[PDB]
Subunit: 241 residues, 6 copies
């Protein structure tokens, strides 16, 4: 291997320059299977990678695991291997009452409630998505006529307190996040997830292109959800090759 965690070589990519990066290792093959010539490359820790072809061009599908830390590793190492465009496809919890489960959300930028983004750029730097990528995802969503929402996403380092969930062992939420969901709601934030702030910030600050699309699994205020989002990211990828 040429990289420390992924266990991949540059030749394994076969010139691929775009990568679809879901969070769950088990979703990798499902995505790769939607394209031509899907082939498993490796599986180490939460990093499962597959290669496939889209319109004749090699494409990579690699899981990031949950959180900005594991995401930063996958992105960095894929970048070392030649990837220049990253499209995250995940699951999300909507916090706006007009966003129903199954809906598709395309993120323009994220509220940085993580710690990893800070390892790439100061907080003043926007965790903004690449225009080309965001455009491709939006156009793709329209192509299949999915109910799409485009906007800001709150990206948290935690699934519980950072998303102001009180149904926990302690039932406590630190001052910083107490009442934070209502604040994000009033600010128009669409949803919560846990990897976009790191992904977008590390890419926008290093000349890498990144997009973010997610399927609504819950509304903080069923199956054809992921499929639609997955179809969208694969279609978007076609326009970014």
């Amino acid at each position: 291997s040429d990289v420390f965690h992924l266990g991949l070589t540059k030749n394994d990519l076969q010139g691929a320059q775009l990568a679809i990066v879901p969070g769950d290792p088990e979703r990798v093959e499902k995505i790769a299977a939607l394209m031509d010539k899907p082939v498993k490359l490796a599986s180490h820790r939460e990093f499962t990678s597959w290669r496939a072809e889209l319109d004749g061009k090699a494409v990579i599908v690699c899981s990031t695991g949950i959180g900005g830390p594991s995401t930063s590793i996958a992105v960095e190492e894929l970048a070392q291997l030649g990837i220049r465009t990253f499209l995250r496809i995940g699951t999300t919890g909507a916090i706006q009452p007009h966003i129903n489960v199954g809906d598709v959300l395309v993120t323009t930028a994220s509220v940085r409630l993580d710690g990893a983004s800070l390892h790439f750029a100061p907080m003043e730097f926007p965790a903004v998505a690449d225009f080309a990528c965001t455009t491709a995802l939006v156009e793709a969503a329209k192509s299949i006529g999915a109910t799409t929402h485009v906007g800001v996403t709150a990206s948290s380092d935690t699934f519980y307190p950072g998303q102001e969930r009180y149904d926990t062992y302690s039932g406590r939420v630190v001052r910083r996040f107490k009442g934070s969901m209502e604040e994000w709601q009033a600010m128009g934030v669409m949803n919560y997830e846990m990897e976009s702030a790191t992904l977008l910030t590390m890419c926008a600050s290093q000349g890498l292109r990144a997009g973010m699309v997610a399927g609504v699994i819950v509304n903080r205020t069923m199956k054809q959800t992921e499929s639609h989002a997955v179809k969208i990211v694969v279609e978007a990828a076609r326009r970014l090759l």
Copy 2:
């Protein structure tokens, strides 16, 4: 009879306008409105000069913001009170990237928040991101005129001098926070420096208002009229696609 404290405008003055082109300089307002139909001066107070025009049958506003986020936040807030829901920032700018030459146009997707006013609307973690529809319209408008466009991040500073790491000053000093900062932004891909977008984009993105920004490159420190006109033509054309 004004409905707002600084702009000296009434909702009636807007004639139903919901979109506003917001340049920084009052002297540029008429020239912009002059590109549209039935342009009429509304008012002039402080750095806030406003004109009303018509685009494809719809009333549009052109109002200056003055220099800086503080002045901008006043114009935007009061315009919002008057009914404006879409704001398009137009201006001329320098550049900090070698590949960006004078005459090019820049469309800002998001801004580095080197201001103070944005913090009065959303914590620093919140992105000073532009509205997708506005950014799309600006890029495509730039497209239709064959403009050489650069789409990316802009550093928005509360100062013209130290915040943009200029040393040709009275003190010749730059506070620790900004020493070596220009090279850091360059390495991070930032296209340029300007002084109102962080405030504009943040206050709009966090209040359900649509905002976008386009600027003509007239200078490049790392290295005049046509550039401007193009930028101006682009913002008006974009406005047309957002009414």
Copy 3:
């Protein structure tokens, strides 16, 4: 035509002036200048309108700063480049103390830094303090004409609305940082709110320039004026030449 980028002034225009009275509104410039000898217009570009006058045979400058720290920072810097060493800001303001009434004059000793520009000159730990000689001159000038004067701290905000905790706005909301802030500043003895002193005082105190500020209260949140505050700033300037 000009030795500076924005003001459109040359050192020659100042005729050796070392002190400038800096109101925020360009319209107030001529009126202030008119109280001195040989007043004459100098230039007008953007929100920067300048006039020159004379006091006790010494040249004095009156130049507007526009609204906010950003425009103020430009004016102060360029005036400093032209030779100005003493700056006296004069404005109108809204008091937040129940016993500071409309018509009263306020002399600021230092300001709460609720701006962004002051940070481009000194870290937050540094005090946005006024020069002692300037503050003394303003206080002594205020007492020579018998105005009801209050000397103390002022809150300097980058915004007219949320930063001064106003809810009579489009969104009707105030970000967490500022919710309940006016009551806190009140309890801390802060006299009023304005929008340029934090930047002015900080940039001058950290660069060897003298700055002071006086303002007339024309309204009180908790429930001719120009002429007096203006009279005070000119009499004070006289003592600083």
Copy 4:
């Protein structure tokens, strides 16, 4: 499942109140194999769990995945399931010249270079380990005579810039971390890893006991990346905390 990510029920724990939490899912079975009656429970995302028995008491081994975010989910849900004591066993990069690859490092407290810890306590709060757990780990390392070091650990949200690694795609390190390794080194910090700040902070601020131990796989004073003792110690330490 009683929890959203682990796919476990309280019954799966069989009364277990202590969990050994490695970062790598593939290390779980290996740890469980050193104990009695090892049984696989589940595997979802980066969370692989096994149950085993130690001195007639049930013990859980569950991976956290890399980083504080994944770790915070594992710890929280295990806590919901009844776990009250957590012992992290991981791998680490030493930043002191005389620490050898293979050495066992027991963490007393961590430098919070993460973001998740802040979701449980403000930065002023110490990412300190529980005294009983730390004592158990040290004492255990003592009974098997392993080369051990006890001290502070820098816990980063990134493997690369946050640990000041420059052999990267960009080759740059943001201002905040430029020259940071030298500073931690001068401050006596022993090593780098990526989960302790979160683990220790979230546990110490919620009445949960946590211990941290790791084996050195690279010495950063020499190289950024390399070309069972710690595992035996965490199991033996666990015996003492039952």
Copy 5:
């Protein structure tokens, strides 16, 4: 006269001492030194009163720090300059947990940094953590002496009043940062409040010096706004 600027002590005055017991009140220095062999007064300047004593044939220093991290940082630094490598703070404290009783002994593993001096040695992310051997010696010494002991986190405040959310004050005002803070620390398991440990533990842990912290509970905040000394002395014995 004096090899250090504030303490008025010379390296010769320590007679090879490498461990110092550092109480806050200068008036308690003599008392502590009295529990050991050959106690001798060394100096008294400002809030710094120092005595030298002997424990199991080894020189030991007892020196007051005065109240707060600033005065503490001076004493620790200058004592370090004179050769001290291990510091054991012994103080008084107010418990904020209902189960901790007045008279109980508290051993601090790490402190919440509500001070400013610690930041002069390490950024906030760094833990104000006690030395492991010192903490162990204190816990063990507590068993030996016999006392209801609690081991845990301590909140170290730069103020006695607003920082410990006390309202019995002239203004009766507590700044936003500290409003409702005591209940937050309570929920997070913090045992008590004191004012020197964050600075002490941080400056020591970040400079290769060993530090331990033990205190006697003199009040319990959930109710209102000699074991420890014997324990710190016994712990010192185990650390020589």
Copy 6:
């Protein structure tokens, strides 16, 4: 509870005899020295680093109470004196200047301080200015002229430490944390006159609570110069600053 209205100072309101102004030096040993410049001085109490005396100035009761080193001990003294009735505080110290033109023996009157402390934050957020009261500053400047000293009026850097916070490297570790590396040069360039360790807390806690506070100090050493005053760096310069704080107090009664 041994006839004290406060927890640390061991003083009662009766002890102040109506005093409303307090001179607050840092060293308890200097309290008696300062009280000696006034009439009928009497020692009130001595507890921890808090030594207090009462004296008469132009026939009015005045308190002199040490604060100890640092904002924490200072905040205790000021708060408890406030509870007892003090409304005006004048700090008098000896300090080391960081400006080349500020010579030993000079007197420094502080208008505001750089908050390099932690206690000030317990009274007001960092954005708040650690500014001195105008009346107090005026009295100190005027008294300086009555005495005839070479005075400098300006900003002071108030640090929670004597060593790294004042960027001193002659220490056990010989290192200075990132935040303070190169900080002295920055403060010098910003016109900061000197370093001391109590003003940020004193000025902030008073300005944010309706109390008046002033700060004056004698320059007994200069961080930029090679030579250092003899055995008595303090005494003469110290006496100058002390004479001034007392003279200033007279105008604030």
